[PDB]
Write a protein that binds this ligand. Sequence first.
Ligand code: PLM
Ligand code: PLM
Lengths: 166, 167
Amino acid sequence: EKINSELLAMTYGSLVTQMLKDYEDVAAINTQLEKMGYKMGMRLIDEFMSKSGLSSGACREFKDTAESIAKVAFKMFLGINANVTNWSKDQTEYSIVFDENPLNDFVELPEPIKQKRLYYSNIICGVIRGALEMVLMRVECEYKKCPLLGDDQSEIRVRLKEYLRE
Amino acid sequence: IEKINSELLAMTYGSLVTQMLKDYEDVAAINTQLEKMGYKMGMRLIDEFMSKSGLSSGACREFKDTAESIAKVAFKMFLGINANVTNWSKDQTEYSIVFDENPLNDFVELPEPIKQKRLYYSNIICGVIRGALEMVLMRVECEYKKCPLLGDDQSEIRVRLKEYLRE
Ligand SMILES: *C(=O)CCCCCCCCCCCCCCC
Ligand SMILES: *C(=O)CCCCCCCCCCCCCCC
């Protein structure tokens, strides 16, 4: 709902504001926002699985995670419609692109923060990594494009590092 | 609202409190900054609440009216919490909002020295109340008095009217 989405956006906005006071190094902020999401995603995967109706085999292959994240997870948690593009030939990498992001609403980065490329929503990358670890996939996930930095759309890259064994 | 969105909000807020708790020696300042974050949010949120709640401007004429509006409508709409009003003052300028469950508190355990320092983990709620009511021209003071994370039997938030404001 819009009001709960506004409330989440403002809460996360308070977090990023706090990080900008507590850290002088934007790279450090990016790293900690991602580590914060990582812990969340390990806990969020259970809510996603139950409320999505997906089975374990919907998560057997790395290739399958693109549609689940872009078409289900993004709508469920952020109300965003995302698309999958830029597949690698070996299908170990894909990009998730989207033109809207409720966390970005009413946000304006000061010029030095833009030039140093803060990824305001970097927490999303951590959530993906932590969630996918729980279905036994170790991935790297990083932002490449964000309209707050003057880019034409948002793009997040997801790369498979290894399949895990329990 | 829905569990997955409420869990997601609880975890995002939890990362905020966790980041602030690095400043472990001035817990009072943490309480205050959490309130100021809520204060700014509540000024921005009040208009949306009025719209989704269907309340008119005259629904907010008297301070006594805010108690049911916050405890019974806002708390359900924003946190999924059912709350109750108690401990009215004789002149109806003070009431408390009491509740036994709080989704922001889920799976949270404060270390013993933080409990002794009386962190109010959910203090952002007090600021939301203060900022929202300012927009309907009430200057209020709103503080936590009891929280189960500190060993209390329930949550209690005190709301006190300081003055009716002028446009
Ligand atoms: C099998 O393929 C499992 C799918 C993994 C679900 C991933 C959920 C992540 C969605 C992004 C949520 C970002 C929330 C940010 C909060 C501030
Ligand atoms: C007229 O007097 C109407 C009363 C104003 C209602 C204000 C709504 C308060 C919202 C409380 C919930 C705080 C949410 C905390 C988010 C982390």
